[PDB]
Design a protein around this ligand. Structure first.
Ligand SMILES: O=C(O)Cc1c[nH]c2ccccc12
Length: 577
């Protein structure tokens, strides 16, 4: 491909595995606060400056694509102006300046060095090595463009809160600009651009090896210190702050990458559509990088609004992993032929299945060791988690077995799609069971029957498939393995589970119009009903329409996201306690 996207899942799991290890080590008291502050000083005083010094001396400025820099800088300036004006017009009259200073920095400035760079290295080190340069151009230039406007607003808050409230605007501007110049990023970028010419882009060998030893450690060490600083740092936001934060994380991770893509499309006019499309897709990938930890440091230095900013940096860090994996593959699909595209969706399914199965094994282990799996509504959720685990496991086994014996393919198909149908039906059965719990006049729910229904009716539907369908031993995507009958059966399973679920939740509400965790159960059901409607749409599109008009590709991708990553929904609702 134009982009070595198979290395994205290992890259994401390396980066976020390091952040998760840092978070675990931080909780587990493996590391003292003196060690944590030593690590912060290593990361910020030596390693980041060394990485910047290295890359800035190396960089051949006369054959950078300045077009991409202008694009991302105009896009970040656009999201800056937008978020800044929106904040100053929306927020409360006194404290609006801290918000209007820090929020657009939050919405534009990203973690480009710690995890953007290993990700762009993974995606583009072979296919476009010049794209690794642009992190070191974009992130600093955007810092010294946009962070002084935001800092100047924050300093206006500091000056207005400071009861003297009348001093020089020049001093406000100067102190804001000074924090930008004192930042090791822009500091070292100026210094390294000077050394660029003083050495004519050649680091002396001894300096080169010293800078390599330090700079290469920045990626891993920065992500580990990020893990340490995440300890407890998502302190429970007020719901109004959560609303503000949803908008800001949407800004950084959806509006900015969309805007970057549009800007590159407007401003690049290079020679070929392939290089243009690759640069456009790189612009989107750039937008998706999470908020820079430096933004939390700025909020702490101003002593202002640490709660929203730290919580949002941490949440944005984690939310960028799904959106990056999703967005990168989604942007790749329009270039692929139908057969490579089937391999692409099975690759997506396999990756999401690994991380979903880990989340499900954790969630299962919680429900089992909690022994809450005995309770009447949670016994059924446990069976759903087992069905989701067998989905993800059957997908993992299937990704290998689709090459191996026809005997093995049929067995693994039976396991995989019977359990997939079982998760489908368990959505509806969990809804009808929480309706039975709400219809509290009733006897104890027939657990044996509801279990035999959720497991056995899908076994009957797949036995039906083996007997009534015909086998596509070529076909890569398991969802077409038994041809038309496969999708007919899938559609009927989805249609039944959606009818059951929707009628159950409607009737639950109509009963209300007169720990069981009925709210969390209905949340699990509702999010799964979104997924079931998506899968029903895929089935009914492929059935009633002969042609997969291109939305069918994006929808089959989201079907795979849901089918194999629904373990994330069940983990988010139960695995986090
Ligand atoms: O915030 C950034 O963009 C870079 C960075 C500076 N100090 C850090 C500590 C941990 C992780 C990343 C960073």
């Amino acid at each position: 491909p134009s982009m070595s996207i198979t290395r994205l899942f290992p890259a994401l799991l390396e980066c976020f595995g390091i952040v998760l290890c840092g978070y675990i080590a931080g909780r587990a008291n493996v590391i003292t606060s003196t060690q944590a502050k030593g690590l912060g000083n290593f990361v910020s005083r030596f390693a980041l400056p060394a990485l910047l010094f290295k890359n800035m001396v190396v960089l051949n400025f006369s054959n950078v694509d300045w077009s991409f820099l202008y694009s991302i800088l105009i896009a970040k300036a656009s999201v800056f102006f937008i978020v800044c004006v929106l904040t100053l017009l929306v927020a409360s009259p006194d404290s609006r300046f801290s918000k209007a200073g820090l929020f657009p920095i939050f919405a534009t400035q990203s973690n480009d060095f710690a995890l953007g760079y290993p990700i762009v290295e993974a995606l583009y080190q072979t296919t476009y090595p010049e794209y690794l340069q642009y992190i070191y151009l974009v992130a600093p230039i955007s810092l010294m463009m946009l962070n002084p406007i935001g800092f100047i607003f924050c300093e206006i808050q500091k000056w207005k809160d400071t009861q003297n409230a009348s001093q020089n605007k020049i001093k406000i501007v100067g102190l804001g600009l000074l924090r930008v110049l004192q930042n090791p990023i822009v500091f070292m970028v100026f210094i390294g651009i000077a050394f660029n010419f003083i050495l004519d882009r050649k680091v002396p060998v001894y300096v080169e090896n010293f800078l390599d030893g330090l700079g290469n450690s920045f990626s891993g060490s920065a992500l580990f210190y990020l893990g340490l600083t995440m300890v407890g740092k998502i302190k429970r936001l007020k719901k109004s702050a959560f609303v503000v934060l949803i908008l800001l994380i949407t800004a950084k991770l959806l509006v900015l990458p969309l805007l970057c893509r549009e800007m590159v499309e407007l401003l690049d006019k290079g020679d070929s559509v392939v290089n243009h499309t690759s640069l456009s897709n790189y612009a989107f990938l750039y937008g998706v990088f999470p908020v820079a930890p430096g933004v939390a440091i700025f909020a702490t230095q101003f002593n202002m609004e640490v709660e929203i900013i730290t919580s949002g940096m941490v949440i944005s860090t984690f939310v960028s992993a799904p959106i990056m994996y999703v967005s990168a593959w989604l942007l790749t699909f329009p270039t692929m032929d139908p057969k490579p595209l089937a391999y692409a969706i099975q690759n997506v399914s396999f990756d999401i299945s690994i991380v979903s199965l880990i989340s499900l094994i954790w969630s299962l282990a919680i429900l089992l060791l909690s022994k809450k799996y005995k309770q009447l509504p949670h016994m059924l959720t446990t069976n759903l988690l087992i069905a989701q685990s067998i989905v993800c496991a059957g997908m993992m086994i299937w990704n290998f077995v689709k090459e191996k014996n026809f005997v093995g393919q049929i067995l693994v198909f039976v396991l995989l799609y019977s359990s997939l149908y079982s998760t489908y039906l368990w959505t509806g059965l969990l809804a009808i069971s929480l309706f039975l719990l709400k219809k509290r006049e009733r006897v104890q729910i027939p657990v044996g029957i509801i279990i035999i229904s959720g497991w056995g009716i899908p076994a009957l539907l797949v036995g039906v498939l083996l007997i009534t369908g015909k086998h596509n031993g070529d076909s890569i995507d398991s969802a077409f393995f038994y041809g038309k009958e496969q999708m007919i059966t899938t559609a009927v399973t989805l249609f039944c589970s959606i009818l059951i679920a929707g009628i159950s939740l409607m009737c639950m509400n109509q009963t209300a119009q007169a720990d069981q965790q009925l709210t969390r159960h209905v949340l699990l059901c509702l999010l799964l009903i979104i997924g079931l409607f998506a899968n029903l749409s895929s089935c009914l599109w492929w059935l009633f329409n002969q042609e997969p008009g291109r939305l069918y590709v994006e929808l089959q991708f989201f079907c795979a996201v849901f089918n194999f990553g629904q373990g994330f929904i069940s983990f988010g609702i139960f695995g986090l306690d």
